[PDB]
Symmetry: none
Subunit: 233 residues, 2 copies
Protein backbone atom coordinates (compact mmCIF):
# COMPACT_ATOMS: atom_id res chain seq x y z
CA UNK A 1 0.00 0.00 0.00
CA UNK A 2 0.92 3.71 -0.14
CA UNK A 3 0.23 6.85 1.90
CA UNK A 4 -2.54 8.43 -0.13
CA UNK A 5 -4.86 5.45 0.06
CA UNK A 6 -4.43 4.74 3.76
CA UNK A 7 -5.04 8.39 4.71
CA UNK A 8 -8.02 8.28 2.35
CA UNK A 9 -9.51 4.96 3.53
CA UNK A 10 -9.41 6.00 7.21
CA UNK A 11 -11.09 9.35 6.51
CA UNK A 12 -13.87 7.36 4.82
CA UNK A 13 -14.14 5.38 8.07
CA UNK A 14 -12.16 2.18 7.44
CA UNK A 15 -10.70 1.13 10.77
CA UNK A 16 -9.81 -2.51 10.02
CA UNK A 17 -6.23 -2.46 8.78
CA UNK A 18 -4.97 -5.63 10.38
CA UNK A 19 -2.23 -7.63 8.57
CA UNK A 20 -1.75 -4.81 6.03
CA UNK A 21 1.88 -4.33 4.95
CA UNK A 22 2.78 -0.67 5.55
CA UNK A 23 6.55 -1.30 5.70
CA UNK A 24 8.64 1.91 5.81
CA UNK A 25 5.64 4.10 4.93
CA UNK A 26 5.82 7.84 5.58
CA UNK A 27 2.77 8.39 7.80
CA UNK A 28 4.01 11.39 9.82
CA UNK A 29 1.26 13.36 11.62
CA UNK A 30 -1.43 10.96 10.42
CA UNK A 31 -4.48 10.88 12.69
CA UNK A 32 -5.14 7.14 13.10
CA UNK A 33 -7.22 7.04 16.31
CA UNK A 34 -9.15 3.85 16.82
CA UNK A 35 -7.59 1.99 13.92
CA UNK A 36 -7.18 -1.78 14.16
CA UNK A 37 -3.65 -2.36 12.84
CA UNK A 38 -2.93 -5.56 14.77
CA UNK A 39 -0.46 -7.94 13.08
CA UNK A 40 0.47 -5.21 10.56
CA UNK A 41 3.97 -4.87 9.07
CA UNK A 42 5.16 -1.39 10.03
CA UNK A 43 8.93 -2.12 9.93
CA UNK A 44 10.92 1.14 9.84
CA UNK A 45 7.71 3.13 9.28
CA UNK A 46 7.62 6.82 10.04
CA UNK A 47 4.69 7.36 12.39
CA UNK A 48 6.41 10.33 13.99
CA UNK A 49 3.80 12.55 15.65
CA UNK A 50 1.01 10.21 14.49
CA UNK A 51 -2.23 10.00 16.45
CA UNK A 52 -2.67 6.33 17.42
CA UNK A 53 -4.82 6.80 20.55
CA UNK A 54 -6.81 3.64 21.30
CA UNK A 55 -5.45 1.77 18.29
CA UNK A 56 -5.30 -2.03 18.04
CA UNK A 57 -1.65 -2.69 17.21
CA UNK A 58 -1.04 -6.02 18.94
CA UNK A 59 1.71 -8.18 17.40
CA UNK A 60 2.45 -5.48 14.85
CA UNK A 61 6.01 -5.26 13.59
CA UNK A 62 7.11 -1.78 14.60
CA UNK A 63 10.80 -2.66 14.89
CA UNK A 64 12.89 0.46 14.24
CA UNK A 65 9.81 2.54 13.38
CA UNK A 66 9.85 6.23 14.22
CA UNK A 67 7.06 6.78 16.73
CA UNK A 68 8.66 9.81 18.38
CA UNK A 69 5.99 12.02 19.82
CA UNK A 70 3.21 9.72 18.59
CA UNK A 71 -0.01 9.53 20.59
CA UNK A 72 -0.31 5.97 21.92
CA UNK A 73 -2.64 6.60 24.90
CA UNK A 74 -4.42 3.37 25.79
CA UNK A 75 -3.32 1.68 22.58
CA UNK A 76 -3.05 -2.13 22.44
CA UNK A 77 0.62 -2.98 21.85
CA UNK A 78 0.65 -6.43 23.51
CA UNK A 79 3.49 -8.60 22.15
CA UNK A 80 4.34 -6.02 19.50
CA UNK A 81 7.90 -5.80 18.21
CA UNK A 82 9.22 -2.34 18.99
CA UNK A 83 12.88 -3.34 19.10
CA UNK A 84 14.95 -0.26 18.37
CA UNK A 85 11.89 1.91 17.59
CA UNK A 86 11.97 5.65 18.31
CA UNK A 87 9.39 6.39 20.99
CA UNK A 88 11.02 9.44 22.56
CA UNK A 89 8.36 11.88 23.81
CA UNK A 90 5.65 9.44 22.73
CA UNK A 91 2.51 9.22 24.84
CA UNK A 92 1.92 5.66 26.04
CA UNK A 93 -0.20 6.69 29.02
CA UNK A 94 -2.36 3.69 29.82
CA UNK A 95 -1.25 1.58 26.84
CA UNK A 96 -1.04 -2.25 26.83
CA UNK A 97 2.58 -3.34 26.34
CA UNK A 98 2.69 -6.66 28.18
CA UNK A 99 5.23 -9.06 26.68
CA UNK A 100 6.18 -6.49 24.04
CA UNK A 101 9.71 -6.28 22.68
CA UNK A 102 11.13 -2.91 23.67
CA UNK A 103 14.82 -3.84 23.65
CA UNK A 104 16.93 -0.77 22.87
CA UNK A 105 13.99 1.42 21.96
CA UNK A 106 14.34 5.10 22.75
CA UNK A 107 11.76 5.95 25.43
CA UNK A 108 13.42 9.20 26.59
CA UNK A 109 10.84 11.58 28.01
CA UNK A 110 8.00 9.37 26.95
CA UNK A 111 4.90 8.97 29.10
CA UNK A 112 4.03 5.47 30.28
CA UNK A 113 1.82 6.58 33.21
CA UNK A 114 -0.20 3.50 34.26
CA UNK A 115 0.72 1.48 31.14
CA UNK A 116 0.90 -2.33 31.13
CA UNK A 117 4.49 -3.57 30.71
CA UNK A 118 4.18 -6.95 32.45
CA UNK A 119 6.90 -9.30 31.16
CA UNK A 120 8.04 -6.85 28.50
CA UNK A 121 11.67 -6.90 27.36
CA UNK A 122 13.12 -3.47 28.01
CA UNK A 123 16.77 -4.56 28.07
CA UNK A 124 19.12 -1.80 26.98
CA UNK A 125 16.35 0.68 26.20
CA UNK A 126 16.79 4.38 26.94
CA UNK A 127 14.04 5.54 29.36
CA UNK A 128 15.91 8.66 30.56
CA UNK A 129 13.47 11.15 31.98
CA UNK A 130 10.48 8.96 31.28
CA UNK A 131 7.29 8.97 33.33
CA UNK A 132 6.19 5.46 34.22
CA UNK A 133 4.39 6.69 37.35
CA UNK A 134 2.17 3.83 38.44
CA UNK A 135 2.92 1.54 35.47
CA UNK A 136 2.94 -2.28 35.64
CA UNK A 137 6.55 -3.49 35.20
CA UNK A 138 6.08 -6.82 36.99
CA UNK A 139 8.52 -9.34 35.57
CA UNK A 140 10.00 -7.12 32.88
CA UNK A 141 13.65 -7.36 31.85
CA UNK A 142 15.34 -4.00 32.46
CA UNK A 143 18.94 -5.24 32.10
CA UNK A 144 21.07 -2.19 31.44
CA UNK A 145 18.30 0.26 30.66
CA UNK A 146 18.86 3.97 31.29
CA UNK A 147 16.31 5.20 33.84
CA UNK A 148 18.12 8.39 34.95
CA UNK A 149 15.55 10.78 36.35
CA UNK A 150 12.73 8.45 35.34
CA UNK A 151 9.51 8.75 37.33
CA UNK A 152 8.52 5.34 38.64
CA UNK A 153 6.82 6.52 41.83
CA UNK A 154 4.22 3.89 42.70
CA UNK A 155 4.99 1.45 39.88
CA UNK A 156 5.09 -2.33 40.30
CA UNK A 157 8.65 -3.60 39.70
CA UNK A 158 8.15 -6.94 41.44
CA UNK A 159 10.32 -9.63 39.91
CA UNK A 160 11.80 -7.35 37.30
CA UNK A 161 15.43 -7.75 36.27
CA UNK A 162 17.15 -4.46 37.03
CA UNK A 163 20.63 -5.96 36.81
CA UNK A 164 23.03 -3.24 35.61
CA UNK A 165 20.26 -0.65 35.04
CA UNK A 166 20.86 3.04 35.66
CA UNK A 167 18.51 4.24 38.46
CA UNK A 168 20.43 7.48 39.17
CA UNK A 169 18.10 10.24 40.41
CA UNK A 170 15.05 8.06 39.61
CA UNK A 171 11.79 8.51 41.51
CA UNK A 172 10.91 5.16 43.08
CA UNK A 173 8.72 6.42 45.96
CA UNK A 174 6.18 3.74 47.00
CA UNK A 175 7.25 1.32 44.24
CA UNK A 176 7.23 -2.47 44.67
CA UNK A 177 10.72 -3.98 44.33
CA UNK A 178 9.77 -7.44 45.67
CA UNK A 179 11.98 -10.22 44.24
CA UNK A 180 13.81 -7.77 41.96
CA UNK A 181 17.42 -8.21 40.83
CA UNK A 182 19.27 -4.96 41.51
CA UNK A 183 22.81 -6.30 41.24
CA UNK A 184 24.90 -3.71 39.41
CA UNK A 185 22.37 -0.90 39.26
CA UNK A 186 23.47 2.65 39.91
CA UNK A 187 21.29 4.03 42.74
CA UNK A 188 23.04 7.44 42.99
CA UNK A 189 20.40 9.94 44.00
CA UNK A 190 17.63 7.32 43.69
CA UNK A 191 14.55 7.85 45.84
CA UNK A 192 13.24 4.58 47.28
CA UNK A 193 11.20 6.15 50.08
CA UNK A 194 8.31 3.87 51.12
CA UNK A 195 9.22 1.34 48.42
CA UNK A 196 8.94 -2.41 49.06
CA UNK A 197 12.39 -3.99 48.79
CA UNK A 198 11.59 -7.31 50.44
CA UNK A 199 13.13 -10.28 48.66
CA UNK A 200 15.11 -8.19 46.21
CA UNK A 201 18.72 -8.99 45.30
CA UNK A 202 20.58 -5.73 45.95
CA UNK A 203 24.21 -4.70 46.08
CA UNK A 204 25.41 -3.25 49.40
CA UNK A 205 26.16 0.10 47.75
CA UNK A 206 22.42 0.70 47.42
CA UNK A 207 22.26 1.35 51.15
CA UNK A 208 24.76 4.22 51.02
CA UNK A 209 23.10 5.92 48.03
CA UNK A 210 19.28 5.66 47.77
CA UNK A 211 17.00 7.46 50.23
CA UNK A 212 15.15 4.67 52.04
CA UNK A 213 12.84 6.60 54.38
CA UNK A 214 10.02 4.18 54.97
CA UNK A 215 11.34 1.42 52.73
CA UNK A 216 10.12 -2.07 53.58
CA UNK A 217 12.95 -4.57 53.99
CA UNK A 218 13.99 -8.09 54.99
CA UNK A 219 15.74 -8.96 58.20
CA UNK A 220 18.76 -10.09 56.15
CA UNK A 221 18.55 -6.81 54.22
CA UNK A 222 18.16 -4.64 57.32
CA UNK A 223 21.33 -6.26 58.69
CA UNK A 224 23.18 -5.36 55.48
CA UNK A 225 21.97 -1.75 55.68
CA UNK A 226 23.74 -1.37 59.04
CA UNK A 227 26.81 -3.30 57.89
CA UNK A 228 26.86 -0.91 54.91
CA UNK A 229 27.16 1.96 57.44
CA UNK A 230 30.10 0.30 59.27
CA UNK A 231 28.54 -1.80 62.05
CA UNK A 232 30.52 -5.01 62.76
CA UNK A 233 29.36 -8.60 63.38
CA UNK B 1 44.26 16.16 115.74
CA UNK B 2 44.90 19.63 114.24
CA UNK B 3 46.70 21.10 111.22
CA UNK B 4 49.94 21.92 113.05
CA UNK B 5 50.34 18.42 114.46
CA UNK B 6 49.53 16.53 111.26
CA UNK B 7 51.94 18.60 109.14
CA UNK B 8 54.60 18.31 111.87
CA UNK B 9 54.17 14.56 112.39
CA UNK B 10 54.46 14.03 108.62
CA UNK B 11 57.71 16.02 108.37
CA UNK B 12 59.03 13.79 111.17
CA UNK B 13 58.20 10.78 108.96
CA UNK B 14 55.01 9.47 110.59
CA UNK B 15 52.74 8.15 107.82
CA UNK B 16 50.09 6.44 110.00
CA UNK B 17 47.12 8.81 110.28
CA UNK B 18 44.38 6.22 109.80
CA UNK B 19 41.07 6.52 111.72
CA UNK B 20 42.09 9.99 113.03
CA UNK B 21 39.30 12.61 112.81
CA UNK B 22 40.51 15.63 110.80
CA UNK B 23 37.01 16.97 109.98
CA UNK B 24 36.82 20.41 108.26
CA UNK B 25 40.61 20.90 108.35
CA UNK B 26 42.56 23.50 106.35
CA UNK B 27 45.23 21.37 104.64
CA UNK B 28 45.51 23.48 101.45
CA UNK B 29 48.70 22.75 99.44
CA UNK B 30 49.93 20.28 102.11
CA UNK B 31 52.19 17.47 100.91
CA UNK B 32 50.78 14.31 102.53
CA UNK B 33 51.96 11.75 99.95
CA UNK B 34 51.94 8.10 100.94
CA UNK B 35 50.14 8.90 104.18
CA UNK B 36 47.78 6.30 105.57
CA UNK B 37 44.52 8.23 106.09
CA UNK B 38 42.29 5.18 105.60
CA UNK B 39 39.04 5.37 107.56
CA UNK B 40 39.67 9.03 108.43
CA UNK B 41 36.73 11.37 108.88
CA UNK B 42 37.52 14.22 106.46
CA UNK B 43 33.92 15.49 106.01
CA UNK B 44 33.96 19.03 104.54
CA UNK B 45 37.76 19.07 104.61
CA UNK B 46 39.68 21.68 102.69
CA UNK B 47 42.33 19.57 100.95
CA UNK B 48 42.57 21.80 97.85
CA UNK B 49 45.72 21.21 95.76
CA UNK B 50 47.30 18.93 98.40
CA UNK B 51 49.87 16.32 97.35
CA UNK B 52 48.38 12.91 98.20
CA UNK B 53 50.19 10.77 95.59
CA UNK B 54 50.04 7.09 96.57
CA UNK B 55 48.29 7.92 99.87
CA UNK B 56 46.06 5.34 101.52
CA UNK B 57 42.53 6.81 101.70
CA UNK B 58 40.42 3.66 101.60
CA UNK B 59 37.08 3.87 103.47
CA UNK B 60 37.72 7.50 104.41
CA UNK B 61 34.85 9.93 104.74
CA UNK B 62 35.70 12.67 102.27
CA UNK B 63 32.11 13.65 101.37
CA UNK B 64 31.95 17.37 100.49
CA UNK B 65 35.70 17.73 100.91
CA UNK B 66 37.48 20.28 98.75
CA UNK B 67 39.99 18.19 96.79
CA UNK B 68 40.24 20.66 93.89
CA UNK B 69 43.62 20.28 92.26
CA UNK B 70 44.76 17.49 94.55
CA UNK B 71 47.29 14.91 93.37
CA UNK B 72 45.81 11.44 93.85
CA UNK B 73 48.16 9.59 91.47
CA UNK B 74 48.03 5.90 92.41
CA UNK B 75 46.34 6.62 95.76
CA UNK B 76 44.24 3.90 97.36
CA UNK B 77 40.67 5.24 97.51
CA UNK B 78 38.93 1.85 97.57
CA UNK B 79 35.45 2.17 99.10
CA UNK B 80 36.01 5.79 100.18
CA UNK B 81 33.02 8.12 100.49
CA UNK B 82 33.49 11.06 98.10
CA UNK B 83 29.83 12.15 97.80
CA UNK B 84 29.52 15.81 96.78
CA UNK B 85 33.25 16.41 96.94
CA UNK B 86 34.92 18.99 94.71
CA UNK B 87 37.49 17.06 92.65
CA UNK B 88 37.61 19.43 89.70
CA UNK B 89 40.94 19.43 87.86
CA UNK B 90 42.29 16.69 90.10
CA UNK B 91 44.70 13.99 88.92
CA UNK B 92 43.49 10.52 89.95
CA UNK B 93 45.54 8.63 87.33
CA UNK B 94 46.00 4.98 88.32
CA UNK B 95 44.26 5.29 91.69
CA UNK B 96 42.20 2.41 93.05
CA UNK B 97 38.61 3.65 93.26
CA UNK B 98 36.78 0.34 93.00
CA UNK B 99 33.48 0.46 94.94
CA UNK B 100 33.99 4.08 96.06
CA UNK B 101 31.02 6.47 96.30
CA UNK B 102 31.42 9.48 93.96
CA UNK B 103 27.72 10.46 93.68
CA UNK B 104 27.05 14.12 92.88
CA UNK B 105 30.78 14.91 92.97
CA UNK B 106 32.24 17.54 90.62
CA UNK B 107 34.96 15.91 88.53
CA UNK B 108 35.16 18.68 85.91
CA UNK B 109 38.42 18.55 83.96
CA UNK B 110 39.80 15.70 86.05
CA UNK B 111 42.19 12.94 84.97
CA UNK B 112 41.14 9.37 85.84
CA UNK B 113 43.53 7.77 83.31
CA UNK B 114 43.72 3.98 83.77
CA UNK B 115 42.16 4.16 87.27
CA UNK B 116 40.16 1.26 88.69
CA UNK B 117 36.53 2.39 89.02
CA UNK B 118 34.89 -1.05 88.95
CA UNK B 119 31.51 -0.99 90.79
CA UNK B 120 31.83 2.66 91.81
CA UNK B 121 28.79 4.91 92.00
CA UNK B 122 29.39 7.94 89.77
CA UNK B 123 25.70 8.87 89.52
CA UNK B 124 24.90 12.52 88.99
CA UNK B 125 28.54 13.60 88.91
CA UNK B 126 29.70 16.34 86.51
CA UNK B 127 32.47 14.77 84.45
CA UNK B 128 32.44 17.60 81.90
CA UNK B 129 35.88 17.70 80.30
CA UNK B 130 37.33 14.82 82.35
CA UNK B 131 39.82 12.24 81.04
CA UNK B 132 39.03 8.57 81.72
CA UNK B 133 41.38 7.13 79.06
CA UNK B 134 41.69 3.36 79.48
CA UNK B 135 39.91 3.30 82.84
CA UNK B 136 38.04 0.34 84.28
CA UNK B 137 34.39 1.39 84.70
CA UNK B 138 32.98 -2.15 84.56
CA UNK B 139 29.78 -2.18 86.58
CA UNK B 140 30.02 1.43 87.70
CA UNK B 141 26.87 3.54 88.06
CA UNK B 142 26.97 6.67 85.86
CA UNK B 143 23.23 7.44 86.31
CA UNK B 144 22.41 10.96 85.20
CA UNK B 145 26.09 11.80 84.96
CA UNK B 146 27.24 14.72 82.81
CA UNK B 147 30.03 13.44 80.55
CA UNK B 148 30.08 16.33 78.05
CA UNK B 149 33.37 16.19 76.13
CA UNK B 150 34.91 13.59 78.43
CA UNK B 151 37.55 11.19 77.11
CA UNK B 152 36.53 7.54 77.64
CA UNK B 153 38.56 6.00 74.80
CA UNK B 154 39.40 2.35 75.44
CA UNK B 155 37.71 2.19 78.83
CA UNK B 156 35.83 -0.85 80.11
CA UNK B 157 32.19 0.19 80.46
CA UNK B 158 30.86 -3.36 80.24
CA UNK B 159 27.72 -3.55 82.34
CA UNK B 160 28.06 -0.02 83.69
CA UNK B 161 24.88 2.04 84.02
CA UNK B 162 24.74 5.06 81.70
CA UNK B 163 20.95 5.54 82.05
CA UNK B 164 20.12 9.22 81.52
CA UNK B 165 23.80 10.13 81.21
CA UNK B 166 24.97 13.06 79.09
CA UNK B 167 27.40 11.61 76.53
CA UNK B 168 27.13 14.66 74.30
CA UNK B 169 30.37 15.01 72.30
CA UNK B 170 32.09 12.31 74.36
CA UNK B 171 34.94 10.17 73.02
CA UNK B 172 34.13 6.45 73.39
CA UNK B 173 36.50 4.99 70.77
CA UNK B 174 37.18 1.25 71.30
CA UNK B 175 35.48 1.22 74.71
CA UNK B 176 33.72 -1.88 76.03
CA UNK B 177 29.98 -1.10 76.18
CA UNK B 178 28.97 -4.77 76.33
CA UNK B 179 25.76 -5.06 78.44
CA UNK B 180 25.81 -1.38 79.45
CA UNK B 181 22.55 0.53 79.72
CA UNK B 182 22.43 3.72 77.64
CA UNK B 183 18.64 4.20 77.73
CA UNK B 184 17.75 7.85 78.06
CA UNK B 185 21.33 9.05 77.44
CA UNK B 186 22.25 12.01 75.22
CA UNK B 187 24.51 10.66 72.44
CA UNK B 188 24.73 13.89 70.39
CA UNK B 189 28.11 14.15 68.72
CA UNK B 190 29.31 11.10 70.63
CA UNK B 191 32.09 9.05 69.08
CA UNK B 192 31.54 5.31 69.54
CA UNK B 193 33.80 4.16 66.73
CA UNK B 194 35.22 0.64 67.25
CA UNK B 195 33.51 0.30 70.64
CA UNK B 196 31.88 -3.02 71.50
CA UNK B 197 28.17 -2.44 72.01
CA UNK B 198 27.11 -6.09 71.99
CA UNK B 199 24.34 -6.73 74.51
CA UNK B 200 23.89 -3.06 75.36
CA UNK B 201 20.49 -1.45 75.84
CA UNK B 202 20.31 1.58 73.51
CA UNK B 203 17.64 3.93 72.22
CA UNK B 204 16.98 4.23 68.49
CA UNK B 205 18.12 7.86 68.74
CA UNK B 206 21.57 6.61 69.75
CA UNK B 207 21.85 5.07 66.27
CA UNK B 208 20.97 8.43 64.64
CA UNK B 209 23.50 10.53 66.61
CA UNK B 210 26.66 8.75 67.74
CA UNK B 211 29.37 7.96 65.22
CA UNK B 212 29.23 4.18 64.94
CA UNK B 213 31.95 3.36 62.41
CA UNK B 214 33.17 -0.17 63.13
CA UNK B 215 31.23 -0.70 66.39
CA UNK B 216 30.29 -4.28 67.30
CA UNK B 217 26.56 -5.02 67.40
CA UNK B 218 23.94 -7.73 67.79
CA UNK B 219 21.91 -9.24 65.01
CA UNK B 220 18.89 -7.69 66.74
CA UNK B 221 20.77 -4.40 67.21
CA UNK B 222 21.74 -3.99 63.54
CA UNK B 223 18.03 -4.25 62.69
CA UNK B 224 17.13 -1.68 65.37
CA UNK B 225 19.79 0.58 63.85
CA UNK B 226 18.25 0.25 60.38
CA UNK B 227 14.72 0.89 61.63
CA UNK B 228 16.04 3.93 63.45
CA UNK B 229 16.75 5.41 60.02
CA UNK B 230 13.23 4.66 58.74
CA UNK B 231 13.39 1.18 57.24
CA UNK B 232 10.05 -0.46 58.01
CA UNK B 233 9.46 -3.97 59.43
Amino acid sequence: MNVGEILRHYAAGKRNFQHINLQEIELTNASLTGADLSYANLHHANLSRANLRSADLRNANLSHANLSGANLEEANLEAANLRGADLHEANLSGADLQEANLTQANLKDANLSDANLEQADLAGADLQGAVLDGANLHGADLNGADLKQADLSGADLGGANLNNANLSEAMLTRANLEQADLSGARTTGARLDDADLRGATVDPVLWRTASLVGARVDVDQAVAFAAAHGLCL
